[PDB]
Amino acid sequence: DITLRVNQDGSEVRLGDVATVEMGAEKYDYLSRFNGKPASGLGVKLASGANEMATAELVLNRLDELAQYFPHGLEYKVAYETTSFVKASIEDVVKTLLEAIALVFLVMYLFLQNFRATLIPTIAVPVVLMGTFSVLYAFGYSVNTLTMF
Amino acid sequence: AMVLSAVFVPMAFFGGTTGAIYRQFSITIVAAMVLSVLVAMILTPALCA
Amino acid sequence: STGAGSGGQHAVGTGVMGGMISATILAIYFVPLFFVLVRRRFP
Amino acid sequence: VLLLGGMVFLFLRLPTSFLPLEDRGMFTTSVQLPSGSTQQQTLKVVEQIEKYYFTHEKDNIMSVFATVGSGPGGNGQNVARMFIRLKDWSERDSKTGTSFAIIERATKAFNQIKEARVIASSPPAISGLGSSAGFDMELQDHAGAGHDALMAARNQLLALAAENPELTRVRHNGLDDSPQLQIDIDQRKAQALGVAIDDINDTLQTAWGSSYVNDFMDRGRVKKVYVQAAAPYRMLPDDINLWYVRNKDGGMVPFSAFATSRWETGSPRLERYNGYSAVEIVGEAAPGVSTGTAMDIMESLVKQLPNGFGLEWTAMSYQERLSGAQAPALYAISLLVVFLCLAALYESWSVPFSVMLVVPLGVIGALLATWMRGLENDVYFQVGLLTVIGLSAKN
Amino acid sequence: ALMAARNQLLALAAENPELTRVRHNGLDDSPQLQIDIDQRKAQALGVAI
Amino acid sequence: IMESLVKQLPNGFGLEWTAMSYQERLSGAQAPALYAISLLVVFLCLAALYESWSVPFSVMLVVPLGVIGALLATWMRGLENDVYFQVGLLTVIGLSAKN
Amino acid sequence: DDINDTLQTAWGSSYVNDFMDRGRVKKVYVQAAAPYRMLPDDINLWYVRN
Amino acid sequence: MANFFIDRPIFAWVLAILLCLTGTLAIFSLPVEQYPDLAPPNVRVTANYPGASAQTLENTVTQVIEQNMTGLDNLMYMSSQSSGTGQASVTLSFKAGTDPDEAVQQVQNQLQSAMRKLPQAVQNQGVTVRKTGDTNILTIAFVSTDGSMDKQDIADYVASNIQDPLSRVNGVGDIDAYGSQYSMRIWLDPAKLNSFQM
Amino acid sequence: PDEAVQQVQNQLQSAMRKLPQAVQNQGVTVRKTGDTNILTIAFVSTDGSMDKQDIADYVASNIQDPLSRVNGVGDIDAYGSQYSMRIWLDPAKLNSFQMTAKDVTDAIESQNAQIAVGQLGGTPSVDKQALNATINAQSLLQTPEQFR
Amino acid sequence: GASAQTLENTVTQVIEQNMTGLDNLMYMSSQSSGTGQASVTLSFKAGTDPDEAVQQVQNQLQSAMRKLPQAVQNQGVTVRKTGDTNILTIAFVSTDGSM
């Protein structure tokens, strides 16, 4: 109904008379598709200084909360995730650490064969681990794949 | 402790992304070594006694 | 280790295993030899 | 002595890498149709690729998220990027369903598609890190000879690199030149007819190209307003003549009266490095050839090119150029410090030599193990080697 | 609804003898004037918007 | 009282303290932690100094004897549990441990 | 506005637009010729359009 | 020093307790991630000229930005590309150890000088200076199972109702969208315009 | 120095619009530099082939920009300016043809510009489109003869 | 020209979006006015460097400039550290009344 001009006869020339007006997309270049069906993506990027696992969990929980108000038909699908890999890495590292402590206990009782002497290193390694974690936090480091290795 | 530090410290001073990758390991291992040596001379003798 | 991150875990495990085996086998013999030689010469 | 020699041999035989590749749970497939291709053909190729993924590698794939209109080498209607997500490591077999096996099969399958260069790859752990064999060079144009001269020099340099056996898989990361349409607006004729050149330019810009005229509010949010020609009226070179421009008197002047169109060639993407017109010529050093040797060969080849065309290394190649054999110097200083500390500890100048000679004892086993298992000289191996050195030294 | 809740809370606070000088820091709603311009009549008369 | 009043409003309206109110709520929340950590540090230091777990335990039993007097004096004078009282209870803990 | 325009373009230089010179976007300037902007009476040489 | 603590086990126990407590606090405090920030700080300047050509974009945007990116600190090299799509990217790779915030601040400050020199359309589209070290945690795809919502409808709904609440999560730094929100589109018809002398 | 530059730039951004439009087009620069030149380089043509103006143009085109990005160089002022398409008006000729200087300026602005026409088949495109090729309008003039 | 509700929906909320989650951010306060001016106040944690906070806000502001309307971008967004510490309030008065 935008009036381009009004003729002297009372006739009007509107924007719809010389063009077709529709509500489309600003950029038609992208044609994102998911599993053969048209879809739109939403990539979330971590802010430095926060846990990526916890951030991903919170994002998924919030999107699940938002999923209650989705119009019929619309569903959110995760097409790319890094939480599983980093969780598996942390689990493997902590498993190796605990298994190494257990094997230290086993070998100590195999050679020295004293339960208390066996306890002596079993209690000395964890305090060094705590000190190392404290130093890493002081230096501004964080639990990475490299630091855990 | 000193020779182990000399083993691990120099990799920290490498330049670039590989330098930072090496620096992570260097700092972690050096901190752990220093803490263990301090614990070895303080906590462990008390436990053994 | 088979699964996620198996690459770096395999790398560190293989390297450490080979190095530690070779060291604990060879040094326990060679280090006395080196010490005896250097103390014999007194350089 | 024989053990030391074997250590040297095994170190020479060990390939060098920066970070091992792990089954991260997903990989990425990229599609690049030949230049001057619409997004419908790209969509057809993407449909073919996703049909292949859903058909053959069905037991391992979980979801493929394609994206037509963008991807490697710059966004365009002939470039598509696909994210393929795989099931949990346990569900897929660890022998024939590993990510590496999947991409190995796919690359064989994808190389049979003549329509477009579709290549599957596994994302790197860090984008900055690159393969040790590969290198990045920026063939610049210091003399300002022009784009055509730069492209001719790039073609000649690529031919020379392909000739050399010390350089493998050398190619440009840019886009090859494509046909373009050149509109010739006869200024004298347009002004004789009474049309204004500014009106002609505005009509062309807001008719064929878009025009972010203003903003409007939709459901409490501001959205852009664009004015552009309808799709059927901006398709062919003959669609130009359909437009009419108004002269001073108010009459409409056809666009064919003062305009003519001809076909020429132009680069879809123009690249500059350090302010100079440049083309990124990426190549990989041949196996058994030092990366520095490959860079020197490339520099000699650039010297063989006509004058005015320099070269500059970028990213990993530039970093390697800056960090020249720092590790040997750092570890020589470390060895000297170790010797001094051991001499102080033992109160002798000869006893510390006994400890220092045990360093090669522990490294040969690690080298032999990492060679037999087929691994490479990655940073993790460096750290493990240092740790075994330290433990042997302590003993 | 927020304004009504604010007014109710302020009335309750005024009732209570253990609170004094409880106030809303912001500004309450005020009348506004809207000028409606008929672009059609403006064009018909010949005056540019 | 303000929090009690805000619960009489129609459901769906909440409240949040800002500026000095937020700082005061932070103080109130962190008080018990400060006392616990300070008591633990004092106990550990005394155990390290006298090489016993009984001397610090016997000493630490006197902290209530001073804290009760500080609380009684503050209550009688009419003062409140402000940041000053907190840095004051810490001083009273120290003085009682000193005796 | 016209007399000001013809006075800050003739006497003072005028950054009209840019042009391409061997691969660089150099500026274009419009100004009076040197002999016609030397004496104080050179203003009388200029003409404006009513 | 060992003989000092042999006679004083309680002192060693106290030191061990302090170390363990500090380590526990650190563990609760320190972040966890896959890899740390291991890359030279790279800053990208993106400008959009709708409907432009590669030559036009390089002439009017890319070179103008390059000529004003001077005085930067620890700048290893500058790489730029002008595409026929209408997007011009200038990448400024800084030396390792440079503060990313300082680098992006300097790049933004240098860009402000050349903002007016850019064409009006480029200014209206907006020129953003952002780091290239973005690490995407998730790539969530929204698909209409019923098929009632078209791709444009899905993209608009996401940009309207989903991009806002998710961007307020504490760990979120940025949320890239792979869809274009609804925009009022006007499709001119040359025959109609010529008919009405417009 | 970085803090001072940040503060000044934050303060300056308020008044950039208040300045005259010509000043904005020229552009305001904030540099953390002094006034003394650490080194002053003189470029001289030994053969005499390059005129003083040619030397200045070459320096400002190929040397000033690369040196300005050298780390540590806060600013590098040039004692010579690059080439420019100088147009010397003649008032007598302008009056002869009844044209003002504004006519010349408008003609140059209109006939020397980079137009963004678009593409042959941009998105959204009609079904079954053969190709998507860029369209080039009139480009910036290069030789002085074109300006004549 | 924006109404208070329109300004809040299209400017203040957008500015809040990206700047949410900054380092050491206690809370955000936004003030959208009917005259068309929108204000967003970020109260960082005590002891944070004000200059670092301003730089962080400016860096994060560039990530939402596009989402802002064109008119808002043209007007420009100002990031200034702001307090309320009125050290002095000098009143200038003329005794004679001539001024």
Side-chain angles (χ1 to χ4, degrees):
Chain A
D1 294 330
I2 289 188
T3 300
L4 303 182
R5 72 181 185 185
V6 171
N7 305 123
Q8 306 176 357
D9 320 358
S11 178
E12 318 174 10
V13 176
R14 304 177 316 278
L15 181 54
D17 293 355
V18 308
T20 295
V21 183
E22 72 167 356
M23 187 174 303
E26 57 187 4
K27 309 164 187 175
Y28 283 87
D29 200 4
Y30 285 72
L31 281 193
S32 301
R33 170 203 288 260
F34 180 84
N35 301 29
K37 295 183 180 179
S40 300
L42 196 67
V44 47
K45 300 171 176 180
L46 181 61
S48 301
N51 317 134
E52 57 180 344
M53 181 186 309
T55 297
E57 187 275 340
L58 290 181
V59 167
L60 290 183
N61 203 332
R62 188 58 198 272
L63 189 48
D64 183 18
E65 168 187 348
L66 267 302
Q68 311 302 325
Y69 316 115
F70 286 173
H72 179 274
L74 182 60
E75 298 175 0
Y76 71 96
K77 324 295 295 183
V78 177
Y80 172 82
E81 179 192 11
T82 66
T83 306
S84 300
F85 189 84
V86 304
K87 178 179 179 58
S89 178
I90 296 306
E91 289 184 355
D92 291 2
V93 169
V94 66
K95 172 190 294 88
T96 49
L97 250 53
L98 298 185
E99 171 261 15
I101 296 182
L103 261 31
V104 165
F105 186 99
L106 292 181
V107 180
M108 271 290 306
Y109 198 78
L110 177 58
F111 279 97
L112 293 206
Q113 301 170 151
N114 297 344
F115 179 76
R116 316 169 74 91
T118 312
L119 292 182
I120 292 181
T122 314
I123 197 183
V125 183
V127 310
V128 183
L129 264 56
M130 295 297 183
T132 306
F133 285 134
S134 169
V135 173
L136 288 182
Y137 178 71
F139 272 82
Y141 275 55
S142 61
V143 170
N144 328 129
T145 303
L146 306 182
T147 49
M148 271 318 192
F149 266 111
Chain B
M2 290 185 179
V3 303
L4 208 58
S5 174
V7 165
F8 289 103
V9 161
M11 75 190 309
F13 301 112
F14 297 158
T17 304
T18 315
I21 293 182
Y22 285 145
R23 182 179 298 102
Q24 301 280 135
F25 290 92
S26 70
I27 286 197
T28 303
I29 295 177
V30 164
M33 159 206 59
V34 171
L35 230 299
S36 60
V37 170
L38 289 181
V39 168
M41 301 168 62
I42 297 179
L43 177 56
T44 48
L47 306 169
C48 297
Chain C
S1 66
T2 61
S6 182
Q9 301 187 28
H10 279 201
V12 296
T14 308
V16 171
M17 168 263 190
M20 287 308 300
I21 290 184
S22 180
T24 195
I25 288 182
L26 292 177
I28 58 175
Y29 287 93
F30 272 92
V31 184
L33 195 272
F34 296 151
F35 177 80
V36 162
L37 261 297
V38 300
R39 267 307 170 94
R40 278 180 181 175
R41 170 59 90 174
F42 293 107
Chain D
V1 174
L2 296 185
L3 263 51
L4 194 63
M7 174 211 74
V8 176
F9 165 78
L10 293 181
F11 172 79
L12 293 184
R13 289 300 182 181
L14 246 298
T16 303
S17 298
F18 298 102
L19 281 178
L21 291 77
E22 299 81 3
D23 186 358
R24 208 166 314 277
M26 86 294 297
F27 62 98
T28 300
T29 305
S30 302
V31 182
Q32 180 173 5
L33 271 71
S35 300
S37 298
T38 61
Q39 77 174 177
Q40 182 175 345
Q41 314 165 188
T42 307
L43 182 63
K44 193 170 185 300
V45 177
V46 162
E47 289 172 351
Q48 174 186 185
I49 297 294
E50 74 170 8
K51 181 183 60 181
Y52 161 77
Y53 273 117
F54 276 150
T55 298
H56 301 256
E57 273 65 25
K58 183 181 184 179
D59 312 4
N60 319 329
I61 199 182
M62 186 181 183
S63 62
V64 40
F65 183 56
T67 304
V68 187
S70 178
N75 305 338
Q77 295 186 15
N78 65 334
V79 178
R81 181 185 297 270
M82 308 172 58
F83 308 100
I84 289 86
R85 184 167 182 260
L86 301 174
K87 305 174 183 176
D88 189 7
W89 293 271
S90 63
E91 301 185 11
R92 34 168 175 162
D93 289 358
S94 182
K95 235 301 179 180
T96 180
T98 70
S99 176
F100 309 102
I102 299 170
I103 69 174
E104 174 185 0
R105 295 179 296 188
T107 46
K108 164 183 173 55
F110 290 156
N111 283 16
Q112 307 170 183
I113 293 184
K114 42 183 172 53
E115 312 166 14
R117 183 200 303 178
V118 41
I119 51 181
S121 58
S122 299
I126 298 298
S127 178
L129 276 314
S131 299
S132 298
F135 57 88
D136 290 1
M137 195 195 59
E138 297 285 346
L139 175 62
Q140 299 180 158
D141 183 17
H142 296 264
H147 178 71
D148 302 4
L150 181 58
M151 298 303 292
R154 182 212 64 174
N155 294 12
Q156 172 182 350
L157 181 53
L158 277 184
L160 295 183
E163 172 189 349
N164 286 156
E166 308 184 23
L167 314 167
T168 309
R169 303 162 55 183
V170 190
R171 67 175 188 88
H172 69 288
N173 287 19
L175 309 185
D176 195 3
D177 293 359
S178 313
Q180 294 178 1
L181 188 64
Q182 175 73 27
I183 305 182
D184 297 330
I185 301 176
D186 197 1
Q187 320 280 353
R188 187 211 61 83
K189 198 170 189 303
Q191 296 198 196
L193 295 176
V195 196
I197 311 303
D198 197 1
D199 295 359
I200 304 169
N201 296 335
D202 169 78
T203 297
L204 286 180
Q205 186 168 2
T206 63
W208 291 75
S210 208
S211 182
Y212 168 53
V213 286
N214 203 11
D215 289 325
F216 88 105
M217 171 164 302
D218 183 21
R219 290 165 298 183
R221 289 173 49 88
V222 284
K223 316 288 183 54
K224 305 186 178 179
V225 188
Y226 284 101
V227 180
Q228 197 186 343
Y233 304 101
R234 52 172 176 82
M235 288 299 110
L236 303 184
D238 292 357
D239 294 331
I240 304 177
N241 312 335
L242 300 184
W243 297 92
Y244 290 76
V245 198
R246 176 168 49 192
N247 52 18
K248 313 176 185 303
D249 308 5
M252 304 304 299
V253 178
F255 229 96
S256 63
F258 53 82
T260 312
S261 57
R262 64 164 182 269
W263 279 99
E264 296 190 4
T265 62
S267 176
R269 188 174 67 175
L270 297 171
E271 305 177 357
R272 302 172 61 86
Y273 192 77
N274 284 333
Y276 298 96
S277 302
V279 284
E280 177 175 351
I281 295 182
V282 170
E284 297 177 355
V289 177
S290 176
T291 61
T293 304
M295 294 190 298
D296 297 1
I297 292 302
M298 290 286 297
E299 187 173 358
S300 301
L301 293 178
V302 176
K303 295 166 184 177
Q304 301 169 188
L305 295 178
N307 299 119
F309 294 91
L311 73 154
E312 296 184 16
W313 308 97
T314 314
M316 291 306 303
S317 185
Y318 183 72
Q319 178 180 346
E320 169 182 341
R321 281 288 184 175
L322 287 188
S323 62
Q326 306 303 324
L330 266 301
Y331 283 109
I333 296 179
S334 174
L335 181 64
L336 183 53
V337 170
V338 166
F339 173 80
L340 293 176
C341 295
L342 293 175
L345 174 58
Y346 302 142
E347 197 59 33
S348 179
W349 297 107
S350 165
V351 186
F353 285 105
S354 179
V355 180
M356 297 194 309
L357 289 179
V358 325
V359 171
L361 299 178
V363 310
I364 177 178
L367 230 43
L368 186 61
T370 194
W371 171 74
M372 290 190 305
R373 204 199 178 100
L375 303 180
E376 295 176 344
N377 187 11
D378 54 319
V379 299
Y380 292 110
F381 177 75
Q382 313 285 2
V383 178
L385 206 273
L386 287 182
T387 54
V388 302
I389 282 185
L391 285 189
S392 58
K394 185 184 308 182
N395 309 340
Chain E
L2 205 280
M3 289 290 108
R6 177 210 66 182
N7 300 330
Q8 176 178 186
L9 178 53
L10 292 184
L12 294 181
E15 291 181 6
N16 190 48
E18 297 186 356
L19 305 177
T20 57
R21 295 176 290 275
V22 45
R23 57 192 169 277
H24 166 38
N25 204 19
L27 310 179
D28 48 356
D29 295 4
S30 72
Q32 298 186 185
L33 187 57
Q34 267 285 160
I35 297 300
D36 298 359
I37 307 173
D38 188 1
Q39 339 286 355
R40 204 150 302 180
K41 280 184 180 179
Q43 294 287 350
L45 299 170
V47 284
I49 312 174
Chain F
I1 297 298
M2 217 59 178
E3 291 185 354
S4 298
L5 262 56
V6 85
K7 294 181 56 58
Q8 309 184 16
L9 297 186
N11 187 26
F13 298 111
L15 85 168
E16 194 160 351
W17 301 105
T18 179
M20 200 184 71
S21 311
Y22 178 78
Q23 299 302 323
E24 169 176 345
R25 282 309 177 94
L26 258 59
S27 301
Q30 291 181 162
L34 176 59
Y35 301 123
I37 295 180
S38 179
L39 263 303
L40 178 60
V41 167
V42 169
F43 179 87
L44 291 188
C45 288
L46 293 191
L49 205 161
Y50 300 97
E51 306 169 14
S52 174
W53 302 109
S54 58
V55 172
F57 180 77
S58 57
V59 166
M60 236 187 59
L61 290 180
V62 84
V63 170
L65 303 185
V67 176
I68 181 60
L71 267 58
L72 189 57
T74 298
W75 185 84
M76 288 183 58
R77 263 288 294 272
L79 305 180
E80 304 137 359
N81 191 343
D82 37 24
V83 176
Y84 294 138
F85 181 71
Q86 296 173 163
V87 306
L89 277 184
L90 273 301
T91 304
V92 168
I93 294 176
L95 270 296
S96 56
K98 179 265 307 179
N99 293 335
Chain G
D1 193 7
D2 288 2
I3 64 191
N4 288 137
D5 191 9
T6 185
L7 204 59
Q8 66 183 174
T9 298
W11 292 84
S13 203
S14 181
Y15 180 19
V16 173
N17 49 13
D18 299 54
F19 83 108
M20 181 62 54
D21 186 15
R22 304 185 311 273
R24 279 190 57 90
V25 276
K26 302 184 176 64
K27 301 186 176 63
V28 182
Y29 281 101
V30 169
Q31 195 187 337
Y36 305 100
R37 54 175 173 83
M38 292 296 129
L39 302 181
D41 295 358
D42 290 330
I43 50 179
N44 300 12
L45 301 176
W46 296 99
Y47 287 76
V48 203
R49 189 161 53 194
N50 50 15
Chain H
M1 185 176 64
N3 300 20
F4 176 81
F5 288 95
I6 287 175
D7 314 358
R8 317 173 189 274
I10 312 299
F11 199 3
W13 277 108
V14 167
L15 291 181
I17 290 180
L18 289 180
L19 285 182
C20 179
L21 187 66
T22 307
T24 301
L25 177 58
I27 292 175
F28 281 171
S29 63
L30 43 60
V32 55
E33 57 184 349
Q34 192 178 358
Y35 298 100
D37 192 8
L38 311 172
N42 298 167
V43 178
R44 170 157 302 187
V45 187
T46 305
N48 207 140
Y49 198 169
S53 176
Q55 183 66 213
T56 294
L57 194 50
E58 184 194 26
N59 293 11
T60 62
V61 175
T62 302
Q63 293 193 20
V64 172
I65 295 181
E66 287 181 343
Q67 294 177 0
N68 295 266
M69 289 301 174
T70 67
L72 302 174
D73 305 2
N74 310 329
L75 180 62
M76 302 177 69
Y77 45 85
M78 161 192 302
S79 177
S80 303
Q81 57 179 204
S82 309
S83 58
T85 304
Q87 174 185 181
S89 300
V90 176
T91 303
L92 308 177
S93 185
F94 296 89
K95 298 197 306 181
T98 310
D99 185 12
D101 301 357
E102 178 63 29
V104 63
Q105 180 70 205
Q106 290 184 351
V107 175
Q108 182 65 28
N109 291 13
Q110 298 300 326
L111 177 61
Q112 296 295 150
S113 306
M115 284 301 301
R116 278 76 185 89
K117 308 175 185 299
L118 301 180
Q120 246 299 145
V122 184
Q123 304 179 13
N124 297 341
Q125 292 292 342
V127 183
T128 45
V129 169
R130 294 175 186 176
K131 299 177 52 185
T132 82
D134 301 358
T135 61
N136 200 35
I137 290 192
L138 305 177
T139 304
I140 306 174
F142 299 84
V143 58
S144 179
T145 304
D146 188 21
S148 60
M149 271 188 164
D150 202 357
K151 53 190 67 56
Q152 307 168 185
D153 310 4
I154 296 175
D156 186 23
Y157 180 87
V158 169
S160 302
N161 316 83
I162 308 304
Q163 195 167 2
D164 176 21
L166 297 186
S167 56
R168 301 188 178 275
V169 185
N170 58 338
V172 171
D174 187 7
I175 295 192
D176 188 9
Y178 307 105
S180 305
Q181 65 178 359
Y182 259 165
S183 71
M184 192 60 58
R185 278 292 183 168
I186 290 90
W187 307 116
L188 306 180
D189 189 3
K192 297 181 178 181
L193 269 68
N194 183 24
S195 297
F196 293 99
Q197 326 295 334
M198 307 295 299
Chain I
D2 303 4
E3 291 292 346
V5 171
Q6 172 185 344
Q7 295 185 7
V8 173
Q9 188 68 210
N10 185 19
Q11 251 75 0
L12 179 66
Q13 198 63 28
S14 176
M16 286 193 60
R17 299 166 288 99
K18 307 178 181 179
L19 300 184
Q21 179 57 34
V23 177
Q24 303 178 192
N25 298 334
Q26 294 293 340
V28 292
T29 61
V30 170
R31 330 293 293 185
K32 45 180 179 63
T33 176
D35 294 358
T36 307
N37 303 6
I38 57 179
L39 51 86
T40 297
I41 311 169
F43 301 87
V44 53
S45 177
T46 303
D47 308 357
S49 61
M50 298 207 310
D51 189 6
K52 152 255 306 178
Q53 182 45 229
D54 302 4
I55 305 172
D57 162 66
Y58 179 89
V59 170
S61 303
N62 301 18
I63 304 175
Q64 178 177 353
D65 290 328
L67 294 188
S68 54
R69 284 184 286 269
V70 173
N71 184 20
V73 185
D75 185 9
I76 164 179
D77 68 323
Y79 302 115
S81 50
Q82 60 181 356
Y83 263 151
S84 178
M85 191 61 60
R86 303 298 307 196
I87 298 178
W88 308 112
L89 300 179
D90 189 4
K93 295 177 180 180
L94 279 173
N95 181 31
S96 178
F97 298 120
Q98 308 177 11
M99 295 178 310
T100 329
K102 185 180 180 184
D103 297 359
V104 173
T105 301
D106 295 1
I108 299 169
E109 285 180 354
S110 63
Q111 302 189 21
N112 177 28
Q114 276 286 348
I115 310 302
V117 162
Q119 308 179 10
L120 283 176
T123 60
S125 59
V126 79
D127 192 7
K128 314 218 66 57
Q129 179 60 23
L131 84 170
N132 167 262
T134 321
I135 309 181
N136 290 320
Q138 57 176 8
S139 57
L140 299 180
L141 307 185
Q142 292 183 170
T143 68
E145 175 56 37
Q146 300 179 12
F147 280 89
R148 299 171 192 174
Chain J
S3 178
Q5 184 60 37
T6 285
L7 177 61
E8 171 180 349
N9 295 334
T10 60
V11 177
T12 77
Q13 190 161 350
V14 177
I15 292 183
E16 293 179 31
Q17 287 186 17
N18 59 318
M19 277 146 51
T20 304
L22 285 175
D23 49 330
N24 302 328
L25 212 180
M26 284 186 171
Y27 48 86
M28 310 185 307
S29 179
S30 176
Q31 311 167 194
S32 56
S33 58
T35 66
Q37 179 185 184
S39 177
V40 177
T41 302
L42 314 184
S43 302
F44 291 88
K45 294 190 57 179
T48 311
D49 189 8
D51 303 358
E52 289 184 3
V54 169
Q55 177 180 177
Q56 194 75 17
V57 170
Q58 287 183 351
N59 298 143
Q60 273 290 342
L61 188 60
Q62 302 295 335
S63 177
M65 199 62 56
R66 288 186 177 273
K67 305 177 184 178
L68 296 181
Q70 172 189 347
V72 181
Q73 301 179 8
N74 178 264
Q75 287 290 342
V77 193
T78 71
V79 177
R80 303 181 57 86
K81 47 184 178 180
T82 303
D84 202 4
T85 155
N86 271 261
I87 298 308
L88 295 178
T89 303
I90 300 98
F92 299 88
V93 66
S94 66
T95 60
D96 303 331
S98 57
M99 297 188 62

